[PDB]
């Protein structure tokens, strides 16, 4: 009965058959569920269900009956099925099939509905007698993201099927059995089924907003009554309303959805009931008022993760983790409590801290490091104080001078290499001369003959003659001979003068092979380099025992730690830890290790892989119950307990050497439980045989006095291959992402490898690996666990590993730190302190719940509107517990909620009267008749959405006008999910920086140019607009491919995860594709793209003009603007539009404008980056679109573009603007008119702020401008605009009209070519005499009148009507066509 508004969203691809959708949703990533269901439908079991409802009904009985899902998992299935999560996954198959399969399968297809692909041969029959073709193109056997494999088999078989028909069932069974036997491995790919219709897909999981566009007024429903500004209590009274109700959850939803309407309805019926000013005892301890914060089992979630898709994926990952834990008899409540424990979080913070290695000469008896300094005895520093209090009493970024030993830097240098030598001579010495408070040492590198000799030479020269003489040889050699090889012509000259009085033990001269000097010194040096792995292609520098690889600007890194170490000393001083007679460098060396392993302590800190241990012994029970196992001792303690697994190729020396060390390590440590997995490179001979050889010797293991006893044990015995073992073996490696013939080590779930050489991992290396690992992962689990009194649940080394391995996996973020939020992955328990009686309410059983949600919502917030709606639907799930906290603010200067909100989402699917799946819509009932509203879509981050069907103005909605024009009080609008984003964050390799100005191309097998974009400075950001399918990213041919080669697109994560050295992107989700690509510079380049060492016209048009309109009037005026151009030029024109701000009425009309006026048009858009600062006010968004994304909004093929405002009219042939010389400037603008005489008062750009800032420069107009795009990108102007905007935008009153203000604020930095004023006319600021020579007219605002825009046009321009008539009759001609 009430006046309503209905909004629906539909995808850009047709709806896949429901059957296949349920298969995919059902078996998320468990393959067994997939094929176990694929059997069921190949019976013809699902043939008897006629309707989607019945079909859906059937799946529930099946899953429950076959043991696939429990209540918790079934409930999760329904929600994910509502969300239609599996539909893009299915469309991936189709797009792949349409674009790579069909054009590479030459011949005549008839009867080949289904067909296996074997050895590039197609078989249309199960009986497999005849093969139709040799398939053209690249291999289809590449395993890609949407693939599934069933069984292990040498041969690989693929079936492209249309499951829908009965023709499928026999084909399946042929290969299911073939895989069951073990002949080959089975996988299914899809074929678009023509039994189904081409109807588009109706989506859900988004939000709709109705924004009040007039907020100025403040002192069933007609209009909101504006109430006297007693805003301050809204949050507080609003919070009480709910608490009082006692059906609280529903109140908040009902209140929060229509909140603007209920503002004046609050403060009534002795309203405050402020018992809860009590709970700011809650505020006093933890969070600030009016802040929204969500936690999921301690995990603090960012806003972007708080959508239905983001949340479904989190539960899925979390339950897998918890279920693993609760097979050891822990309640969901106990499990979570252990995960978020204080001792656990402390450990993460603990090894976020730096680990140091002992850089001293002590082991090598002081004969390896050749220092250029001594700060306690150098008579340069003599002037300085040797006092501790010099350190402690410091502030700033300046280096404190001191005569003390406190900071050291040891840099290993190769004396053959010029660049290396140059470091010492220029780099190291300047620092000395400069009186820096750092001691500088260097140790030569000995990887070649010449290097060995030159270390000897320099070492000798130091020993007898001294530092200066040695220094001297080095300096002279660098300039003089310019090579590593020793030069006597250079050497002898040095001794000639520098050989005066070589003290102590005498010089021997001429030739060196001192038994001691060559042996001891060089081999001691080698022992130092080897010990700390300070050599290779990339050497390692040690500052205060902290490894810094010799790359990029390592001194920048050193300076960072130098200040960070100083602050570490200061704090010990204020606690009085320090004293005057102390060796300060040993404050750092307290916990330092003598030996450094790059595997255990990788210098890429992120590099860490942990596996779920319970999973490993559950999935591969067949394998792990038949591996040689050394049980850890009967009589050893819980603290001693640890579990180790060695994966090695026993057909290689390195593989068997590695195991000997592991066995040795086991003899010493009684607490460890060892497992041996034989992973061979060549699988011609069964892996089961060598495993069977050892399990017989299992009892006798580690009784190998010598290595050959192990070697011999491998050779002897006759065995029968357990081919069941072999199958589980190759499944394990596939699950664990391990290659064949690769060596790996696993202690308590953590993987290190591949081990190329067994010398890398020795007995001593296992000991530290256990020592370190023990500390972090095991000791925080043990304490925490015991604190809760769950320490009864640990029954052995394997029992313990399950827990420790699970809790290590809990703290690994999905999102790399520094991108979406800087904050680390630390699970807080800090809200448990909070009193709950009067602000909290809980939903779901805590006793049974596996999922625990903690929401802190401010009722007055607009963000809260979304949060409540989503959380209500996730609360409906069984096995989920939710607890809500309401926290309003007293600080309300402006109206808090200025919109109505509806979230389109259901917890379980809805069905038709005819049993089809119900589409979901946002229906607003009882909308005020007199309020002007704006329709907005609050869509998940990866989505790009535009209006498709609407007859109304969504920018200016009013029921009274629609009623008086259309006769209906009911509004319906349909949107289209046109694109889904592929977005990523780039980095250069190895010295990781964002490559800006790099150009990229997206491609498909059908077309080599889907899309193109350029790399941004901020986070090496880039994006593409695409739909489900298989794509590839190639650097654009030109300068980009000249300078770089991209090793990878980061599709597996930040990584590098092995197996990701790929450039293939696929999108099979509503979350799009997130990528972290890597690019390494080609041989010796410090080059830059941005600086140099008829195309666009042909592709597009003579003239390229772009614009935006945000109303029916402005779109009507835009039609006139385009026409005026056309009449005024005998040239070719192409028009460009900002797609999402335009009406469907306008969108449906243009082809008709294009046919009549003879122009070309193209729709463009870009999605506002997540890092870039948003605009809550739509008009401001629009302005941002014209200036912020100029370089990335238009294809690279476009040389230049021109912006013309919608209200404008042009009498000029527009080419002239193209030909206008810009004098090497990126863009050109026209200034403000000075010509009108008496207008001055309203000329605000002659005031203090604008005249002080614009010293001599003009105040420009954003109605018309030229962008020399090629130059724009070349100058990388965009990046500067974007970062200045982001920086300025922190202040809300910063840019009145950003579009005009940003180019004006940046004209110092970025040149603006100024235009002849023949180019702009405006009555308000230009004289009437001026318009004779006027080229174009903007209709700028009155403001000494109130005459409106429609009036100015008719009065100001007589030919405006002529243009309007032309459009008017055509629109009617179309309507009557
Ligand atoms: C992937 O799906 C399969 C099949 O649905 C899951 O396997 C099933 O796991 C259950 C345990 O949840 C097995 O039941 C029993 O487990 C106990 C464990 O102690 C064991 O002692 C019993 O003998 C029995 O196996 C069940 O047999 C097994 N298969 C089926 C058809 O139910 C598997 O857990 C799923 N994987 C993931 C990642 O969840
Ligand atoms: C209702 O509020 C008024 C004003 O604060 C107060 O005088 C009155 O006592 C309240 N009613 C009750 C039942 O306490
Ligand atoms: C929680 O309430 C109790 C009882 O009034 C009080 O003693 C305690 O301090 C409160 N906690 C906080 C942090 O306000
Ligand atoms: C304190 O002074 C003593 C005495 O000279 C010295 O041996 C030591 O380095 C200092 N610190 C401690 C912990 O004794
Ligand atoms: C278009 O072409 C005609 C014929 O050559 C010419 O007379 C006319 O002036 C041209 N239009 C304009 C405005 O340049």
């Amino acid at each position: 009965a009430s006046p309503s508004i209905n909004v629906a969203l539909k995808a850009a691809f047709p709806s896949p058959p429901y059957l296949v959708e349920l298969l995919e949703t059902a078996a998320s990533d468990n393959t067994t569920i997939y094929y176990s269901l694929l059997d069921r439908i190949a019976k013809g079991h699902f043939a008897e269900a006629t309707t989607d409802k019945a079909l859906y009904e059937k799946f529930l009985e099946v899953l429950r009956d076959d043991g696939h899902m429990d209540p918790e998992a079934l409930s999760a299935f329904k929600l994910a099925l509502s969300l239609r999560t599996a539909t893009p996954r299915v469309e991936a198959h189709y797009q792949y099939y349409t674009a790579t399969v069909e054009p590479s399968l030459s011949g005549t297809q008839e009867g080949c509905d289904q067909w296996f692909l074997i050895d590039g041969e197609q078989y249309c029959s199960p009986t497999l007698d005849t093969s139709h073709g040799k398939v053209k193109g690249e291999d289809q056997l590449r395993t890609l993201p949407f693939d599934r494999k069933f069984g292990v088999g040498s041969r690989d078989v693929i079936l492209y099927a249309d499951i829908t028909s009965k023709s499928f069932a026999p084909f399946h069974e042929v290969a299911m059995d073939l895989a069951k036997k073990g002949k080959a491995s089975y996988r299914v790919r899809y074929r678009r089924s023509p039994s189904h219709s081409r109807e588009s897909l109706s989506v859900n999981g988004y939000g709709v907003e109705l924004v009040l566009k007039r907020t100025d007024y403040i002192v069933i429903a007609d209009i909101k009554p504006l109430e006297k500004s007693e805003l301050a209590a809204l949050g507080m009274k609003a919070a009480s309303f709910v608490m009082q109700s006692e059906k609280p959850f529903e109140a908040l939803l009902k209140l929060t959805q229509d909140f603007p309407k209920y503002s004046n309805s609050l403060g009534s019926q002795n309203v405050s009931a402020e018992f809860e000013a009590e709970h700011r005892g809650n505020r006093e301890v933890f969070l600030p008022e009016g802040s929204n914060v969500l936690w999921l089992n301690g995990l603090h979630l960012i806003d972007r993760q708080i959508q239905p898709f983001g949340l479904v994926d989190l539960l899925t990952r979390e339950r897998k983790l918890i279920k693993s834990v609760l097979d050891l008899g822990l309640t969901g409540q106990q499990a979570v409590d252990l995960l978020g424990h204080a001792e656990v979080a402390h450990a993460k913070s603990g090894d976020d801290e730096p680990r140091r290695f002992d850089w001293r000469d002590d082991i090598e008896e002081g004969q390896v490091i050749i220092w250029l300094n001594n700060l306690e005895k150098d008579k340069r520093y003599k002037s300085f104080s040797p006092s501790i209090w010099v350190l402690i009493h410091h502030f700033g970024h300046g280096l404190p001078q001191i005569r003390r030993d406190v900071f050291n830097l040891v840099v290993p240098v190769d004396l053959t290499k010029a660049d290396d030598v140059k470091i010492v001579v220029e780099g190291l010495l300047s620092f000395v001369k400069r009186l820096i408070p750092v001691r500088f040492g260097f140790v030569p590198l000995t990887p070649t003959g010449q290097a060995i000799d030159q270390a000897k030479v320099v070492y000798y020269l130091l020993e007898n003659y001294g530092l200066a003489a040695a220094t001297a040889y080095l300096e002279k050699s660098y300039e003089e001979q310019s090579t590593g090889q020793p030069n006597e012509r250079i050497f002898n000259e040095v001794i000639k003068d520098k050989s005066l009085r070589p003290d102590g033990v005498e010089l021997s001269f001429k030739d060196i092979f001192i038994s001691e000097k060559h042996e001891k010194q060089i081999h001691l040096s080698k022992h130092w380099v080897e010990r700390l792995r300070a050599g290779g292609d990339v050497p390692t520098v040690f500052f205060d025992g902290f490894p810094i690889p010799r790359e990029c600007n390592w001194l920048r890194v050193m300076n960072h730690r130098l200040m960070q170490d100083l602050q570490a000393l200061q704090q010990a001083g204020y606690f009085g830890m320090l004293n005057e007679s102390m060796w300060l460098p040993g404050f750092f060396l307290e916990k330092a290790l003598s030996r450094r392993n790059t595997l255990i302590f990788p210098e890429d800190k992120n590099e860490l892989t942990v596996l779920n241990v319970n999973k490993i012994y559950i999935e591969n029970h067949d394998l792990m119950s038949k591996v040689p196992v050394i049980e850890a001792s009967k009589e050893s303690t819980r603290d001693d307990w640890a579990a180790l697994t060695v994966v090695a190729d026993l057909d290689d020396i390195e593989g068997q050497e590695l195991v000997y060390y592991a066995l040795r390590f086991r003899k010493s440590n009684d607490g460890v439980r060892l497992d041996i997995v034989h992973n061979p490179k060549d699988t011609s001979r069964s892996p089961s045989v060598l495993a069977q050889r050892l399990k017989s010797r299992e009892d006798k293991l580690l009784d190998f006095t010598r290595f050959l006893d192990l070697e011999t044990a491998l050779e002897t015995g006759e065995f029968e291959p357990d081919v069941a073992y072999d199958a589980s073996l190759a499944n394990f490696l596939a699950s664990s992402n391990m290659k064949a013939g690769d060596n790996f080590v696993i202690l308590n779930g953590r993987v290190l490898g591949p081990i190329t050489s067994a010398d890398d991992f020795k007995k001593e290396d296992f000991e530290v690996f256990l020592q370190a690992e023990r500390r972090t992962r095991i000791l925080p689990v043990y304490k925490a666990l015991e604190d809760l009194g769950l320490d009864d649940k640990v029954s052995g080394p394997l029992s313990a590993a399950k827990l420790t391995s699970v809790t290590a996996l809990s703290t690994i973020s999905d999102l790399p730190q520094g991108i979406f939020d800087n904050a680390p992955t630390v699970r807080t328990t800090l809200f448990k302190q909070w009193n709950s009686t009067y602000t909290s309410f809980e939903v779901g059983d805590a006793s049974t719940a596996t999922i625990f949600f903690v929401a802190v919502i401010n009722p007055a917030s607009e963000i809260g509107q979304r949060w409540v709606a989503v959380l209500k639907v996730l609360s409906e799930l069984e096995g989920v517990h939710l607890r809500v906290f309401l926290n309003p603010t007293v600080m309300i200067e402006e109206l808090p909620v200025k919109r109505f909100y509806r979230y389109v989402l259901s917890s379980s699917p809805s069905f038709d009267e005819s049993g089809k799946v119900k589409a979901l819509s946002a229906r607003f009932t009882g909308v005020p008749r007199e309020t002007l509203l704006v329709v907005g879509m609050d869509v998940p981050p990866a989505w790009l959405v535009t209006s498709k069907v609407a007859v109304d103005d969504l920018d200016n909605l009013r029921i009274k006008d629609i009623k008086a024009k259309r006769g209906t009080e009911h509004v319906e609008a349909i949107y289209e999910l046109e694109h889904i984003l592929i977005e990523g964050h780039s980095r250069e390799i190895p010295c990781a920086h964002a490559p800006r100005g790099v150009q990229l191309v997206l491609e498909t097998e059908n077309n080599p140019h889907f899309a193109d974009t350029i790399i941004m400075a901020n986070l090496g950001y880039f994006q593409f607009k695409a739909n489900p399918g298989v794509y590839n990213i190639r650097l654009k041919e030109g300068r980009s491919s000249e300078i770089f080669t991209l090793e990878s697109v980061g599709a597996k994560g930040w990584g590098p995860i092995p197996g990701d050295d790929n450039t293939e992107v696929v999108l099979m989700d509503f979350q799009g594709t997130t990528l972290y690509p890597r690019l390494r510079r080609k041989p010796g380049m410090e080059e830059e793209d941005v600086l140099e060492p008829s195309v666009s016209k042909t592709e597009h048009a003579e003239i390229n003009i772009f614009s935006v309109a945000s109303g029916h009037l402005y779109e009507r005026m835009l039609n006139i603007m385009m026409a005026s151009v056309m009449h005024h030029t005998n040239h070719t024109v192409k028009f460009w539009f900002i797609e999402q701000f335009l009406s469907p009425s306008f969108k449906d009309f243009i082809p008709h404008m294009a046919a009549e006026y003879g122009f070309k048009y193209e729709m463009v858009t870009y999605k506002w980056p997540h890092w870039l600062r948003q605009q809550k006010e739509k008009q401001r968004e629009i302005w941002g679109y014209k200036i912020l994304f100029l370089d990335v909004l238009f294809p690279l093929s476009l040389d230049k573009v021109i912006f013309v405002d919608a209200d404008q009219i042009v009498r000029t042939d527009m080419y002239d603007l193209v030909e206008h010389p810009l004098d090497g400037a990126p863009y050109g603008f026209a200034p403000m008119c000075d010509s009108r005489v008496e207008m001055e008062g309203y000329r605000f750009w002659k005031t203090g702020y604008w005249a002080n800032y614009l010293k001599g420069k003009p105040y420009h107009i954003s109605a018309l401008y030229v962008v020399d795009l090629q130059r724009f990108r070349e100058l990388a102007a965009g990046d500067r605009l974007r970062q200045q905007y982001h920086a300025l935008s922190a202040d809300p009153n910063s840019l009145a009209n950003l579009d005009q203000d940003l180019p004006n604020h940046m004209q110092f930095t970025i040149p603006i070519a100024t235009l002849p004023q023949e180019w702009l006319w405006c009555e308000t600021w230009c004289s009437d005499e001026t318009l004779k020579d006027a080229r174009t007219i903007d209709l700028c605002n009155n403001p000494m009148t109130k005459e409106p825009k429609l009036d100015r046009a008719r009065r100001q321009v007589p030919e405006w009507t002529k243009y309007d008539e032309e459009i008017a009759e055509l629109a009617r001609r179309v309507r009557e066509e």
Side-chain angles (χ1 to χ4, degrees), residues 418-525:
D419 308 327
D420 285 36
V421 173
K422 151 171 192 177
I423 289 182
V424 173
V425 177
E426 309 185 14
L428 298 181
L429 291 168
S430 294
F431 308 157
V432 174
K433 207 166 184 181
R434 304 252 296 276
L435 298 161
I436 302 178
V438 164
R439 190 169 175 193
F440 295 89
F442 82 98
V443 297
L445 292 192
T446 62
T448 60
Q450 312 168 1
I452 294 166
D453 300 348
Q454 221 147 197
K456 297 176 230 177
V457 176
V458 178
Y459 268 130
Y460 165 65
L461 184 54
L462 171 73
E463 187 102 74
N464 294 158
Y465 298 62
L467 177 66
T471 291
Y473 176 77
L474 299 172
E475 302 206 48
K476 205 179 191 147
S477 185
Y478 170 48
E479 67 176 343
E480 187 63 18
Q481 191 53 246
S482 297
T483 53
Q485 192 168 350
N487 186 215
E488 296 79 3
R489 289 181 183 177
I490 189 167
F491 178 79
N492 265 338
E493 311 164 10
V494 175
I495 289 178
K496 278 280 205 73
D497 61 355
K498 286 292 180 185
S499 184
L500 170 70
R501 298 171 184 178
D503 296 343
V505 182
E506 315 167 318
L507 57 81
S508 67
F509 284 107
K510 298 198 175 192
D511 290 342
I512 299 98
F513 69 88
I514 307 301
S515 181
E516 293 305 315
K517 195 175 64 196
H518 159 100
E519 214 196 337
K520 273 215 140 190
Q521 256 186 358
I522 297 166
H523 290 78
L524 282 172
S525 85

Side-chain angles (χ1 to χ4, degrees), residues 571-585:
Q571 62 179 22
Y574 284 105
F575 287 80
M577 308 284 183
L578 293 154
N579 84 21
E580 198 63 25
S581 53
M582 263 198 180
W583 199 48
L584 289 166

Side-chain angles (χ1 to χ4, degrees), residues 1127-1130:
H1127 280 112
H1128 300 198
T1129 183
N1130 321 74

Side-chain angles (χ1 to χ4, degrees), residues 6 66 229 377 689 758 782 849 941 972 1003 1137 1160:
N6 191 331
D66 294 341
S229 86
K377 288 135 205 196
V689 295
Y782 289 170
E972 284 176 319
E1003 61 171 290
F1137 311 104
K1160 296 205 162 184

